[PDB]
């Protein structure tokens, strides 16, 4: 607080509108270069013309302020009249580039507004993701690196902007999930994937399931009927309470009637593997809506298969092979050699009992690149680490530090020196 | 793996399957294994080395 009292705090944080504008400008530069450059030229022109109008107003007010005599008896009045006529002509001509700017902004809006909304949603889910496991904290430069991978490395690179936008969106979702979940635990992969599924659903001619998702997230925490015990014909007390809590949904109204009407449906909803075949029903329903209804039914009936049902929902929403690369082994060579800046250290956070030093040394043997592996924990080790870092920056070799988590008080200036 | 004799491939397959089973059994503790052992990469390397020897 002694330092807090003496200074005026100013935060340059990132907002939704600023992120949307930056991502829209980047998309314009990547896709429509001449259109983006003429747009920028027109904004610069509009700013210059507005400055000229302000100069006109100030000059006219100053000239009429200090005439020091009759207006009709001076020629300076005539000169100011001529200048005002010229500036009236240019403010009249301003309407043409105003209309051209209007055409430009409507075109870019109708072409790339949902993409920028997806940009904002994905990056702010990315920032809010840090509330789980304290370990991942993704910065804005990480998202910008994702965009430099998406827009500038287009697989199967087309020459059609309408389908190129959809290709960019799908590739963005896929590589965002790949790059984030490459550095998370396996328990949070499904959470991140279904958050991205929610973003994709929000970004699309599909009705929003706001009440459905609100009840899915806050169905157990909501208050249910007290003392109302349904039939225990084929459902336990917990399943009956879940059915009671679900029954307030308008789509699932006569669930109590339906479960006993489908008396033969004791296998499609109980035992076996219910994630594949789901009984009952939620008008032609969309496949995503059917997946949502099946997910709610699974959460009400068999909470064990909730992970499988969420995986199937993610598969139906973003593609069957959306998260089929996580179970593949980690191809670290291409990731290091292609998508890692030399100024960014490669963090390898490992659970106890499973190290990565063998992986790094195998990489060194494969690429035939020399490494000084230095074990952190002594003053001599710190000096050797600084010397090796300086030599590696000068020459171009790789430097490796092991058991890095034993000196945060040194990691602070290590990060500062790296920056 | 491809080094002679040809049965070394099947032996390594059996060893990999055994390692995978006894490593996946650690998730369902204490029903799989009574204690949370660490059947890491080092045990796999030692088993491969002794099979080769």
């Amino acid at each position: 607080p002694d330092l807090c009292s003496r200074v005026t705090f100013v935060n340059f944080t990132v907002t939704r509108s600023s992120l949307q504008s930056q991502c829209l400008n980047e998309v314009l530069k990547a896709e429509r270069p001449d259109v983006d450059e003429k747009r920028s030229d027109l904004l610069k022109l509009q700013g210059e013309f507005q400055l000229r109008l302000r100069q006109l107003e100030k000059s006219l007010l100053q000239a009429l302020n200090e005439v020091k005599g009759r207006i009709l008896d001076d020629d300076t009045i005539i000169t100011t009249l001529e200048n005002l006529k010229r500036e009236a002509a240019e403010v009249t001509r301003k309407v043409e580039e105003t209309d051209i700017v209007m055409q430009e902004v409507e075109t870019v809006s109708q072409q790339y507004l949902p993409l920028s909304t997806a940009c904002s949603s994905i990056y702010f889910t990315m920032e809010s993701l840090k509330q789980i496991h304290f370990l991942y904290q993704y910065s804005l430069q990480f998202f910008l690196d994702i965009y430099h991978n998406v827009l500038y490395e287009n697989p199967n690179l087309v020459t059609d902007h309408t389908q190129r936008l959809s290709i960019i969106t799908k590739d963005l979702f896929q590589v965002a999930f790949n790059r984030v979940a490459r550095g998370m635990l396996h328990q949070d992969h499904i959470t991140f994937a279904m958050l991205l599924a929610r973003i994709k659903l929000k970004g699309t001619g599909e009705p929003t399931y706001d009440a459905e998702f609100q009840h899915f997230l806050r169905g157990n925490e909501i208050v249910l009927s007290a003392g109302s015990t349904p039939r225990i014909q084929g459902l336990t007390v917990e399943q009956a309470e879940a059915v009671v809590r679900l029954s307030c949904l308008p789509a699932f109204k006569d669930l109590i009637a339906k479960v006993q009407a489908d008396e033969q449906f004791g296998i499609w909803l109980d035992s076996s593997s219910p994630e594949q075949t789901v009984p009952y029903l939620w008008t032609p329903a969309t496949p995503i809506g059917q997946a949502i209804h099946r997910l709610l039914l699974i959460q009400a009936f068999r909470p064990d298969r909730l992970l499988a049902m969420a995986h199937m929902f993610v598969s139906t929403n973003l593609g069957e092979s959306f998260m089929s690369i996580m179970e593949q082994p980690l191809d670290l060579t291409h990731i290091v050699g292609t998508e890692v800046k030399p100024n960014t250290p490669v963090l390898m956070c490992s659970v106890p009992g499973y190290d990565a030093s063998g992986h790094v040394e195998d990489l060194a043997a494969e690429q035939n690149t020399q490494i000084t592996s230095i074990a952190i924990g002594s003053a001599e080790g710190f000096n050797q680490a600084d010397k090796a870092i300086n030599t590696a920056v000068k020459s171009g070799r790789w430097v490796m530090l092991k058991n890095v988590h034993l000196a945060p008080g040194w990691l602070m200036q290590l990060e500062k020196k790296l920056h | 793996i491809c080094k002679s004799p040809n049965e070394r491939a099947r032996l390594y397959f059996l060893l990999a399957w055994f390692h995978a089973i006894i490593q996946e059994r650690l998730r369902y503790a204490p029903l799989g294994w009574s204690k949370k052992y660490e059947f890491g990469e080092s045990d796999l390397r030692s088993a491969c080395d002794t099979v080769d020897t």
């Binding site: 702010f124 889910t125 809010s128 993701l129 509330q131 789980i132 328990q187 949070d188 499904i190 959470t191 279904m194 958050l195 899915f216 997230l217 806050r218 157990n220 925490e221 959460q299 909470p303 064990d304 298969r305 909730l306 992970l307 969420a310 | 998730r27 369902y28």
Partner: peptide
């Protein structure tokens, strides 16, 4: 795997609920 899968689903729901939060004794 039933209890483990159930508690994993509960933890997933709690994690996304924490995500949606930003958006005398």
């Amino acid at each position: 795997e039933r209890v483990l899968l159930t508690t994993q689903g509960v933890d997933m729901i709690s994690k996304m609920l924490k995500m949606q939060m930003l958006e005398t004794l």
